[PDB]
Each structure stands twice: as C-alpha cells, then as structure tokens.
Amino acid sequence: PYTPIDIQKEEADFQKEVAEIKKWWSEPRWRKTKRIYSAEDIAKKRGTLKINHPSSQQADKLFKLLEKHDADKTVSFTFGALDPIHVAQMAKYLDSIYVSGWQCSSTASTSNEPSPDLADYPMDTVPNKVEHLWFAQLFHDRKQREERLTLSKEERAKTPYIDFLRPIIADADTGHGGITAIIKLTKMFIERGAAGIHIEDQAPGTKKCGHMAGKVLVPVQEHINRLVAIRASADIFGSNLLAVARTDSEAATLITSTIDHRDHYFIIGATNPEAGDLAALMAEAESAAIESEWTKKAGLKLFHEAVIDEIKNGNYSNKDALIKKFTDKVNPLSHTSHKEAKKLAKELTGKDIYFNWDVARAREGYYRYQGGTQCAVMRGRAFAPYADLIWMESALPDYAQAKEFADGVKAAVPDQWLAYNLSPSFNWNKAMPADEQETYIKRLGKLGYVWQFITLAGLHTTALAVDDFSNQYSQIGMKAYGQTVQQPEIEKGVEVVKHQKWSGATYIDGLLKMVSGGVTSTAAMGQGVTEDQFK
C-alpha cells in the first residue's frame, strides 16, 4: 500500500546534498552574498529529484560579464525588449537584455488587459515575457547553428556569428505580494529563463513606475526580507540568479510603518502640540483649504530639523558647536532610532522636544517621509549584502546626484556593483546637450554603474516606427514600404528582410527532410519560394 525506503541512504543523501550546497556557496560568485539560513535549512526544502534550470548558466554568463565590466570600468548598456524580433536584432550589438514591467503593463499582460505601470497585471506576466524572449533566443541560436554546420569550414569563417543568448534581467516589481509570493515569482523567473531580476522597496498595490508621484515605501527590513526570499528561492531550485535591489526613496514621500529604526531619521512629524490628527479632521469635515491650513500650523519637519530649530532660536550659548554634537551622532546614515535621538536632544538642550508623526499620517494610514539621495544611500548600504546590484531611481539624469549616490554607497561597500535607469521619462535634449549625452553612460561607468538600461526604448522605437510608416502608408501607398522600410532594410545589414530564412524556414525544412528519410515533396524553401528575389 506504500513504498519502502532505505532510511540510512536517505540520511546519507541528505548529508551529501548539504555538503554540495556548502561547496556551491563557497564559490567566488557568492563572495559578497550574505545568507541568514544554513545549507541544512535549504536542503530540507528541496525534493528527491534534482532539476537543472538552464537559466542559471545565463546567470553565470551575466556575472562574469559584469565582473569584467567592473574591472575595466566600462558598462553593459541595454534597453527594454518587447518581443522575439527585438532580442534577435539586439543580440548583434548588446551583451545583456532588459525586460520591463512598464512595457509589460501596456503590451504583455497575461490577461491581455493593459494598464499604466502599477504592477497590477497577474503575477506571471513578466516571467512569461522572459520565456517569450528566452525561447526566441534559444530558437534562433538553434537555427543559426544548423545554418553554420551545413556550411563548410571555409564558408563558416566568412559568415558572421550572432550571440543570441544574451542574459536577461527582468522586472519583479515589488514582488507581487508576501514572502511566499516572492519565492513563487522567483521560481517562475528561474524556470522561464531569467538571468537576473530586480525588486523595489515600494508597497505592493500602491506600486508606481518610478517617475510617477505618490510613491509609498516599505521599512528597510521588509525589503531586505524580500531579497532574502529571492535568494532562498534561487538556493532551493539551484540558480545563480542575480538579485538587483531598487530603492525609490529619492523621491518617495510616504511609508507604511515606522517599525524600523533606520527609517526614523526620515519620518516627518508635527512640532506643534496643538495640531490634532489631520486624517480625522478631514474625515469630520468631509462627512483642500483646511489641509493647507493645518499643515502650516502643524509645522511639519524631520526631528533633527526640529532639534536644530530649538537650538538656533533658543537660549543656548554655543550654538553652532551644539548642532554638531547632534549631527555627528544623528544623521541619515547613522541609523539612530527616534527614542535614542530624543534622549540625546534632551541631554543637549534639556527639553523633551515635541514631535508627533502619527498626526501627519495620510488617510490610508501611511506615515510621511522625506527621502533624498542620502536616504537612498542609507538603503543602498542596507540592501548591499543581499543584492548583486544596487539601483536608485532618480527624477532627472543628473551626474552630480549619481556620483553622490555611488560615492555614498561605495564608501561603506566599495565593491558593490551599481545600476542606473537611463529613463525616457526624462526629456533628454532638455536635460543636457548632445556632447554630454554621448559620454553620459561612459562617465557613470567610471563611478561603478556597471549595468545601465533605457527602460522604455523598445516601446518608443516601435511607436515612432509604426506611426511614421502608417502615416506614409496612408499618403503614398506601397511606395511607403519600398522607401521607408524594405530598401533601408537591404541597405542596412538587417537580416529580417529575408524573413523566411530569418524565421527559421530552412532550419525546419531540415527537420522535415530528416524525418522523412532524406527527401520530401512539401519542402518549404524548395524551388518556388519568393526569396530568390533577394539575391
């Protein structure tokens, strides 16, 4: 009625596996990777049947690729790919590939229902998009190998080689739920060909793009746990999957809890004892002008601003020197809890300086929050142990700020790889001249931004191209196609204009003949095909 098992061999295999994992973790890949669980803990989570996900090889390829870039102080630069066509053409020029959540929202949801970048498509949407590209890469790699190996050695060496298998880094948004969600999301990403995934310290289901407004953060620890959870998943299912940690704390103005000491410096509160709960005041009025009045009266600021203000406008003898006692101990990076910072302020001034961040809460319950670049450095440093790349969303393409953040992070973790969003949400001809544009990536490369991506480039290139042709098409008919697309395709290298070959027809005619004993009457690229018009 059941199956028997050798209990001794069980333990033996368990122990064997524990050791295999310990050896795995000791590899150079994990040199900077903090793990808070044991190899024992992980082995227990695995099954009796080992599975090897090819995605992991692309993780390795990605890591080595980034190693060399870091050493040479140069950049793996890429952008957001839409579809199999993109990755097939990109592979000629670029050495990694970005799958964008923003683009997936508009073009690739698994319910087919589009949206703005809110990560409210179904969870499997981006994982499915990776497989979309993954499998295309694999297919075109397979096609090209057949094309090559049916040539002579003499002919091979003439015909160029494309590396279709560029590693993919994919948007995991905020992880699409709790820890168990994130494990399952990571599992899918691994199964469907992800070399690396990135994940952001926003609250789920308030999730914004990045250069949208009203961004809510989560406690530092909560997002650490997310990164741990990714790693836990990758450890169980056995991928060297790269983890990227993103922070939206440059611009964010809200946060879900005050629970984490590291956040306290940045939590905004009311200095005026007389101010009551704004949330409840609005609720009673509703059952604006009253808000803008309450805010002025409430005197909102960060607690240290409040301490400095007390000392500045106070009966204190040696004021400049007394700020510095406080600021040297209490600052963005200093991780000083609020109780602790109040205690010091009392020692230095003799007041319990009043501060209430409960009353400034939004109606949803979020606490108010003043991040900038230094907050982002704080969170960068915190994530760094858990994350192979670190990434700070910025409202502009500002070199100074990028340096501030890079310097800030590397001061505490000098070997940390950084990543930068080259966002089309910026107007790029407004933000800098073209001479600077050309060198901007390179310059950030020096600061240690080893991976950079234009998130929405695939969207926009396609959008321009289709709108432009549609316009021509409407005006001058088939001349538009000859002129705007097909001639240009021939004159530039573009492989797709011979689209039967590109799509893998001669590859499949191979499979057809092979199965039919060498010969077949229904050959797809035999005499008659209309691609002899492209010779």
Choose the contact partner of 97 out of its own copies, Mg ion, none; CB within 5 to 8 A by kind.
Answer: none
Backbone φ and ψ for 422, nearest 5 degrees, come out as: -90, 70
CA distance linking residue 84 with residue 504, whole number of Å:
13
The stretch among 22-30, 313-321, 362-370, 382-390 that binds its own copies (CB under 8 A) is 362-370
Contact 276, 359 (CB under 8 A): yes
CA distance linking residue 101 with residue 351, whole number of Å:
49
Residues 295-324 that bind its own copies (CB under 8 A): none
Residue 425 marked as a ligand binder = yes
CA distance linking residue 394 with residue 330, whole number of Å:
25
Residues 97-126 that bind its own copies (CB under 8 A): 102, 105-107, 110-125
Nearest-approach distance from CB 374 to its own copies, in angstroms: 19
Q: Please tell me whether residue 403 binds its own copies under the rule CB under 8 A.
A: no
Q: Please tell me whether residue 44 binds its own copies under the rule CB under 8 A.
A: yes
How much is the CA Rg of the chain, to the nearest whole Å? 28
Residue 455 marked as a ligand binder = yes
Residue (102 or 326) nearer to Mg ion, CB: 102
The stretch among 23-31, 241-249, 364-372, 398-406 that binds its own copies (CB under 8 A) is 364-372
Map residue 466 onto helix, strand or coil. Answer: helix
Residues 66-125 that bind Mg ion (CB under 5 A): 100-102
Residue 193 marked as a ligand binder = no
**Site map 487..526 versus its own copies, x via CB under 8 A:** xxx--xxx-xx-xx--xxx-xx-xxx-xxxxxxxxxxxxx
Choose the contact partner of 470 out of its own copies, Mg ion, none; CB within 5 to 8 A by kind.
Answer: its own copies
**Site map 69..88 versus its own copies, x via CB under 8 A:** --------x-x--xxxxx--
Backbone φ and ψ for 523, nearest 5 degrees, come out as: -70, 135
Q: Please tell me whether residue 439 binds its own copies under the rule CB under 8 A.
A: yes
Phi-psi region of 109 (alpha: psi -120 to 50; beta: other; left: phi over 0): beta
Residue (193 or 458) nearer to Mg ion, CB: 458
Which residue among 76, 186, 247, 256 contacts its own copies (CB under 8 A)? 256
DSSP state of 72: T
State both tokens at 192.
């469907």
CA distance linking residue 67 with residue 417, whole number of Å:
9
State both tokens at 74.
């140069």
Partnered with residue 197 across adjacent β-strands are: 170, 243
Choose the contact partner of 357 out of Mg ion, its own copies, none; CB within 5 to 8 A by kind.
Answer: none
Q: Please tell me whether residue 369 binds Mg ion under the rule CB under 5 A.
A: no
Residues 174-203 that bind its own copies (CB under 8 A): 176-181, 183-184, 187-188
CA distance linking residue 144 with residue 426, whole number of Å:
38
Q: Tell me the CB-side half-sphere exposure of residue 29, using CA atoms within 13 A.
A: 20
Strand pairing category for 76-79 and 449-454: parallel
Which residue among 131, 171, 263, 404 contacts Mg ion (CB under 5 A)? 171
The stretch among 239-247, 370-378, 401-409, 422-430 that binds its own copies (CB under 8 A) is 422-430
Residues at the site binding Mg ion, with contacts judged by CB under 5 A = 100-102, 171
